[PDB]
Amino acid sequence: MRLNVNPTRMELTRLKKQLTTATRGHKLLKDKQDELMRQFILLIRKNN
Amino acid sequence: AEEIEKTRRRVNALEYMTIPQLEETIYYIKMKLEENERAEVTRLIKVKNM
Amino acid sequence: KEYRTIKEVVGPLMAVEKVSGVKYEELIEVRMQNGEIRRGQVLEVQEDKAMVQIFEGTSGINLKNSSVRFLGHPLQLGVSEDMIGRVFDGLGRPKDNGPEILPEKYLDINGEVINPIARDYPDEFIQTGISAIDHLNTLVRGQKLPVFSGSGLPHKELAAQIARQATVLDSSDDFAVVFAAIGITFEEAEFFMEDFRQTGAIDRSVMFMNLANDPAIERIATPRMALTAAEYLAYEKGMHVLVIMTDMTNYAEALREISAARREVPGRRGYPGYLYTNLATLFERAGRIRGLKGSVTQIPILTMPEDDKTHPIPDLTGYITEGQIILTRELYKSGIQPPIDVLPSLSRLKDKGTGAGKTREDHAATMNQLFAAYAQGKQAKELAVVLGESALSDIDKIYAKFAERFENEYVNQGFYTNRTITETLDLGWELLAMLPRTELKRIKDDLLDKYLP
Amino acid sequence: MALTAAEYLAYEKGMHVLVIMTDMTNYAEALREISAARREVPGRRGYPGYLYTNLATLFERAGRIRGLKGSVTQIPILTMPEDDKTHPIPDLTGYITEGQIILTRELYKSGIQPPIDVLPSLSRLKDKGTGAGKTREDHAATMNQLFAAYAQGKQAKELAVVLGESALSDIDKIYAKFAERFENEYVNQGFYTNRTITETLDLGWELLAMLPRTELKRIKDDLLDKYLP
Amino acid sequence: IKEYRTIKEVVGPLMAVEKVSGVKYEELIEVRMQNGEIRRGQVLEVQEDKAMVQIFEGTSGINLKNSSVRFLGHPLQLGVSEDMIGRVFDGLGRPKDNGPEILPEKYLDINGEVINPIARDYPDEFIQTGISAIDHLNTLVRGQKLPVFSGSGLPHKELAAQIARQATVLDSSDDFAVVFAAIGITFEEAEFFMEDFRQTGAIDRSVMFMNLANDPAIERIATPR
Amino acid sequence: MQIGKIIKVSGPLVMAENMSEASIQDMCLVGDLGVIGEIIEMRQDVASIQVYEETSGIGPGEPVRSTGEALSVELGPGIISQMFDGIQRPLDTFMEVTQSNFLGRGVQLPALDHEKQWWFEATIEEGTEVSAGDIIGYVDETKIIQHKIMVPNGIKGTVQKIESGSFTIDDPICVIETEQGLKELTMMQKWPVRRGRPIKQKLNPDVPMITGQRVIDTFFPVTKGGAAAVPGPFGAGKTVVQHQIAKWSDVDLVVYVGCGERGNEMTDVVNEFPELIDPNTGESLMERTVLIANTSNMPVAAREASIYTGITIAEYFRDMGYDVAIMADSTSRWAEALREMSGRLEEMPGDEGYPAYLGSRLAEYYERSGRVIALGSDQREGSITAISAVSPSGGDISEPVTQNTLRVVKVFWGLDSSLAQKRHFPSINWIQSYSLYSTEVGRYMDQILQQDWSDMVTEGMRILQEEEQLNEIVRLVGIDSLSDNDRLTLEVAKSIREDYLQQNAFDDVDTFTSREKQFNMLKVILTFGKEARKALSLGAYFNEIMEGTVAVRERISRSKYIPEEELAKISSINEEIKETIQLIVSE
Amino acid sequence: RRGRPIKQKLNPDVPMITGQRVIDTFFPVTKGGAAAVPGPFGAGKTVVQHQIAKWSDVDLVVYVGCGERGNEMTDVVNEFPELIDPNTGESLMERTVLIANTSNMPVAAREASIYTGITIAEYFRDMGYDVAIMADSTSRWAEALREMSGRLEEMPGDEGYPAYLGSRLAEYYERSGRVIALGSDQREGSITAISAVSPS
Amino acid sequence: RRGRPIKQKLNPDVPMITGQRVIDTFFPVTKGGAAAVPGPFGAGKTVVQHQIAKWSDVDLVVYVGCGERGNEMTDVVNEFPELIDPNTGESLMERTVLIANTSNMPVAAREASIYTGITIAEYFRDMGYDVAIMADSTSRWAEALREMSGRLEEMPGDEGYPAYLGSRLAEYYERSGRVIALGSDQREGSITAISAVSPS
Ligand SMILES: Nc1ncnc2c1ncn2[C@@H]1O[C@H](COP(=O)(O)OP(=O)(O)O)[C@@H](O)[C@H]1O
Ligand SMILES: Nc1ncnc2c1ncn2[C@@H]1O[C@H](COP(=O)(O)OP(=O)(O)O)[C@@H](O)[C@H]1O
Ligand SMILES: [Mg+2]
Ligand SMILES: [Mg+2]
């Protein structure tokens, strides 16, 4: 839960940018998950 | 259905592992340079008082 | 009155004994045994002695057979009407091989603090020729708008491009451009002087040049000279002046050097404890004054160490200057010229120079529309490369097509391509025309059909 | 005292000396004790500003000289504080010495003997050191291939344990499987087993054999056919 | 008594007195300013004929040539009495409730002495605080050091005052007191306590030492002692 | 006075010998020029001085004259409707005499007008014995303000000689006979800025201040004598908020303190403030306001001593029995100056380079504000309500300045930039904001209004808090699950957001709101969602009511613009909503 | 420590031939340009400078090795006489000048090695030849200055380095570049700086 | 401060029986070995050390209360004399030696407590006995060194601790181990060192 020690200063702000990308990605994949699920449930009822 | 699980894994792995490891690391990194900064400032006062 | 009483020499610092009537920061000059003459400055003076720092170094000095002279005056500048067109050094000495000027009067480069009640706030719009600066983050007279760059981001081209294209509109007052250069490589210095010569801007501007190898003690005096010259052109000649300084990061590095010379302990990040105040002393000297038709506007340029705003140099600068223009590595490496990113960029007094009387009546209304649409287009772009092109609603796809067309045709004009305000405004419409008439909720029924293609 | 006795036996008496020094970390600790006692201006972490120089006056005392048959070769051992490579002691040592051999807890916990992480390690004399005449001519191409393969394989394994093995491509799983087998047999050999250079090279090809020829763009094609299994 | 008119120098809150004798470490002093004002201070270190002191109220407004320093020959003390019950004091034991002055039975160093580990007796007795979460799951014991870890805005004020009045000892002990100590708190926070104590009659069972945020920093660290 | 002699000059530090009669923290004029300075240290007769203006041109041998006093201010007629710097230098008077638009070194001049003549009116009768603070007479400086001249501290006795007439501040308008001797009293008194003015007793700020801004007085009220911290990022319109506070709040005077702010922010304060108009009199607000102005390039001490000058002047009118409101902006810029002065003294730094006494220095300030009982047999009470602005580094409230401020204040009005482009005016985040006076104010407004106002506010915040959590979960699965029972509370909260929290301060009615108006307003929206919750539990699905309640949502925000006298319409809105749902409950 | 006088100074236009595809293509340095190679130990800073010294299209090279390994220098003198490459038909030693300063050599001599290698470069520059000077490593010069600054108990700057580090480095680079020599023959001469920086 | 002389050291190869399943099985300690117990407050540093003092198969136990709670030492002098093992008939207090310098006790005496206990442990080690010493806590010892360091105006050092901290620690633990006591008998004794570290 600490990864590894890589002490640098500009690395901190690049990490903050990496954080925002991760949140962006997490956001994108969350409402992608629901839209894939949206059609999945639709097709199950046809499937069964 | 298979791809949901793959995407679900990625979301979970990203939310539980990746992001918290990032946050807790930048804090421990911030604390380090916070201490290092003033650990030098004190030494400099010793240099000043020579 | 030449004293031959040199007691100590440590580093650039020198100690003179058996003196009187010596003042703080008083200029000195030392006559060597060989005859070589070097200048200096009193960094500290006690009851029967004084410490001085030599600009030209301390190499090869015999203490016994050398002498020091006290000139009885601080660093002053020769003020003259015949100053425009010529190139000077950090101290004010000519570098252009021209007729040495006879100054009207000598003034202390420190200047004085302008009375708060005396200050008159700026309204006049100033055109810089750059769309990203003249429309989205508009420059107003007497404003203090900096530029944030990095090592290798074309901040020297933009610096040249501004002064060349910077012009007051209509106003019958002539336009002065006091350029100041701080601790720059020769190529960069030669670049600027040549570029101002050919464009004829040299005859429309004053130049203060300071190379990197030039002594650090005059690197700090370089802006104070320019600002004093700029104040000499605006407040006592009624001219609208624009000041450009580069580099400001170099100013701090040199400011740090003379602090360790005084053996002063640095406050934060290795920079002295008066950095914020020392910056404010030469930054906050800009703007109109009540009763006078003068104008002083500053565009200080600095390179953020490793592209970081939280660094003391651009951070502390933010507390003093109104807004910021930020250049982006990602943009410059994509061929964007100038590589200005408008999202983090800001101008706190932009609305003061917009609207009828100063610019087109849709200036403010348009500005926010292009701005909001850019962010939305960038967000459409980021989701596109993660979910594919088809996941987008095809009008989010046109917002994406808008957002790259926005950078390639609007933001990117070229370092040698001037853009007048009107040409920039209807250009936005031409780009907003891509978007249908349904989303443009920042513009009203007078202006939307009065200008849209 | 050791390095002087080393250069004495090796040069005056023409012997072949191997210098082992541990713990090298405890040496720099001693310097800082005297430095802090002398109220000297401290460098990083309180260590003397002249640490790089003093350390150099030890490590540089090694090599061979013209006319003299003897040799002095030096293998110092230091424990990295905080397990931190960027610490002054391992930093300055790395800048002086001709490479370094690095141990890792991750490998050591995995039961790897010796736990040598081959990626951040380095030798600065491997060039002129090996090739035809002293080794087989494949010695230069094998290591450079194993490097690029392990670099890709290990990173793929990282992605595997978090996103699943079925999230990799077919060639990724080939490298991921290679990367693991690399650690367990090539790196791990036991502390009491002696591998001749021949056996190592032979094993080298065996481990990288399980890859398509088209992917290996770092080995001579004429060299491949001859030594490829 | 010793009265010395010689002050070598004054720097910040720190003062230097010369030509001195019989002065001790942590000894208490009194500064007689030129305007008659009396400020208290403490000896931080003493060497030879020189003693370094620190002034509580501060060194602001002091003329050296016309001020004098008196060394009281005792460390920071407290006047103790059984009549302290029901009373309210400041950080330095000076009365604050504007009631009658107290004639102390004796004076004690606020540093006190360390209990001999052998002579110590393991706590081993129950205290009823009233709060169930404490009295049952995190029981308070007579002689225990049991702290409360809180946060900003959190009702640790309300909890403290509650315990202050609710806490009693079973077995009908006619003698049970509460010493409430306030350190560097705002005016209203202080008034909250002093008002709740009086209206619940808890003041009659308690001794209060109230120190404020604007009060001298030295007074703030001497308050718990 | 004794004259000193400079023996050393190095930057801002100046040491001068022969300063034996001087005191610590004394102000003194340094060098031939006469620049102001502060005595920090003193060994023997050699005093160390921190010169606050640049020491260029200053050298050893030059004189040093001590003022004999620490940094003080002039308190008397001629102070109101004036603009000074941090050390009380009249900026307009400065310009007139020095004939310059600049601030020159070594320029000393009186703060008040000593040549101006005022008409004094003796209300005190000869023979009575006076105490500290007792009013002897008054001078109508500028109505609305009656400048009540009162007896200074350190003197008391029977008054012998006195009657009205036209005098100046130097003229002894009265004579008291203390047992020490016969000392005459001028109508101006001087007082140190780093020492609080004495009082009889400090009381609790329990009486709410009527600002009229709904978001404040209802959820986050500040009492007379309270203290409030406001973080103002750009765009949040912090200036708009400050102006409304200065004008509408039921205080007697206003003290503005600009500490080390931008040059292009300070003259805005200067010129836009006379443009403000005082409602009760219809005249400019500057006739009610004392202003302190400083810029980021002005002397570092003036920037540091700014808030202490203003709070001292505030304590002066506080002793008159008036209610004062001192506004400081920015205190984060003030602390960024206090930090610098520490560095010059080579003090061992605390958090983020700030001094270790930043908290104490801040605590000393805010503790001087509050409801007090002023000295004097009259035992009149006054109040100082402190409004201070902070400018955090990254919007971070964990920074030392903001943190230490909230440690000694009870009200926090968080200005959010995210709400700014949402056109939420005022831009105050109702979630992060808080007020510890809310409960005490609740008991006050419950009684004086004679309604259950506190219950309405408690209900208001509880709904809005639920909106937050709902928004977090409605972010998932979209509107689904419909949760009409939850969805209802959203339409109430959405309403509560617009009707009350939003108010255009430029609209002639939407800029001020008295108590009974606020009560009637919130009562509508509350009873809406209550009667809306009624038809919910009776089996009626509710979008069918959302369409029926189109006719009432047109009036709930028209009530916002409803005039003062016409609250009759702002009462019929409430039993009207009863019949609407009822007519829809029949279906 | 004195810059050799010139008539005036020119902008470096002509690209150099490194032979290294990475730098010759995407990140090129002109004849008389200033290049820096920052990187941790093992990144190949010395290798690069060796590769540039071997196959550069210049007329003379001054490889300055201060504060770095001794074997690295003995490597150069063992091989460079044996390597042959145009524009010279002869060996590379007939083109190069070595200034060796091992890490265990005296510390004060490190600053000397830099200032001597650049003066020799300025010398052949005045002739009209194109010269390239490789400083390996420039960090050692700074670390050398840091000791002497500490031993003098001077008030240090960032990371203990002297506050005059930035000014002293500028003097070294503003003593390079394409210029025209003195006299009136007006020969053009360029000094290219390939500095090796080794950040901790 | 000077360690008692021995003939020679021996390798600790005999494991100690602590009665703690987690320790004796997975992370055992030998007689003469040394073990560190770093942990936050309330983790069980003191409880663990009390268990070793109670059940370990040693001849003597020397417990050091270095700058910790006074009740934790009072708890021992009371309970230990009432803890009898079934074979001897005699209590546990008849094999223990307690050293107690609590937190509020003079800081300088914390270091003395550490050196007093280990020397006593050496005294019975020379009798051929197996001794086990507990230090609780060694952090308070280091905190004592830092206090006197600042008073002596010494220079750091890491985190305020003096530069000689590691040496003092290394010197301390090196005094433990399997030894051959001086004498013709060449009897064997040992000292097992258990130390609680209290990291911030
Ligand atoms: N361009 C390269 N090609 C092949 N191997 C290289 C290259 N650069 C470095 N190496 C390898 O890395 C090692 C480090 O070389 P060196 O230049 O001394 O590193 P540094 O200068 O960064 O300390 C060399 O011994 C070499 O084997
Ligand atoms: N081995 C254990 N068995 C049961 N409880 C334990 C054990 N170790 C610790 N505890 C509990 O944890 C608490 C902490 O004990 P202690 O050793 O004093 O902590 P530390 O010394 O680490 O500050 C004890 O009160 C005890 O209740
Ligand atoms: Mg190298
Ligand atoms: Mg414990």
Residue numbers in the entry:
A (entry chain G): 1 to 48
B (entry chain G): 157 to 206
C (entry chain D): 3 to 455
D (entry chain F): 227 to 455
E (entry chain E): 2 to 226
F (entry chain A): 1 to 587
G (entry chain C), H (entry chain B): 194 to 393
Recite the paper's sentences.
V-ATPases function as proton pumps in acidic organelles and plasma membranes of eukaryotic cells. Furthermore, E. hirae V-ATPase physiologically functions as an ion pump, similar to eukaryotic V-ATPases34353637, and is composed of nine subunits with amino acid sequences that are homologous to those of the corresponding subunits of eukaryotic V-ATPases638. Thus, the V1 motor achieves its rotational dynamics via several conformational changes that are generated by the binding of ATP, release of Pi and ADP, and cooperative coupling among these conformational changes.
Next, we soaked the crystals of eV1 in 20 μM ADP, and the crystal structure (denoted 2ADPV1) was solved at a resolution of 3.3 Å. Two ADP:Mg2+ molecules were bound to the ‘bound' and ‘tight' forms of eV1, as in the case of 2ATPV1, and induced conformational changes with the crystal packing rearrangements. The eV1 ‘bound' form did not show a conformational change upon ADP binding (r.m.s.d.=0.48 Å). However, the eV1 ‘tight' form changed to a more open conformation (AC from ACR; BC' from BCR) upon ADP binding. We designated the new ADP-bound ACBC' pair of 2ADPV1 as the ‘ADP-bound' form. According to the observed conformational changes, the DF axis became tilted towards the ‘ADP-bound' form to maintain the extensive protein–protein interactions between DF and the ‘ADP-bound' form. The last conformation of the AB pair (eV1-‘empty'), which did not bind to ADP, also showed a cooperative conformational change. Specifically, Eh-A (AO) and Eh-B (BC) of the ‘empty' form were attracted to the DF axis and the ‘ADP-bound' form, respectively. The wider conformation of the resultant AB (AO'BO'') pair was most similar to that of the eA3B3-‘bindable' form (AO'BO: ATP-accessible state) among all AB pairs (r.m.s.d.=0.94 Å), and was thus denoted a ‘bindable-like' form. Based on these findings, we inferred that the structure of 2ADPV1 corresponds to the state of waiting for ATP binding (that is, the ATP-binding dwell) in the rotation.
